[PDB]
Amino acid sequence: PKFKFKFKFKFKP
Amino acid sequence: PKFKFKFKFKFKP
Amino acid sequence: PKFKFKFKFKFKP
Amino acid sequence: PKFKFKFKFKFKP
Amino acid sequence: PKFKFKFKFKFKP
Amino acid sequence: PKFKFKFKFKFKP
């Protein structure tokens, strides 16, 4: 089949 | 000093 | 089982 | 002064 | 194929 | 305010 994974990381000091 | 990361993965059968 | 991967990194000081 | 790096890799088994 | 993603976030005060 | 982030993405066929 088709699998899509998106990972987003946002960093604030 | 904000950091933004985007990761995209696509699976094709 | 074809694989496509995209990585985006953004850093702002 | 912001730095952005993007790398995309596609491969087939 | 089965693709597995692990995300770890650590923040120090 | 140190931040450590680890992300791992793996594919098993």
Add this chain to the structure above:
Amino acid sequence: PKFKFKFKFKFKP
């Protein structure tokens, strides 16, 4: 406030 980001991508045929 030092920041460490780790991204890992693994592809197996």
Add this chain to the structure above:
Amino acid sequence: PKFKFKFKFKFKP
């Protein structure tokens, strides 16, 4: 023909 991509980002104040 396995492909591995690692991205590391380090920010220092």
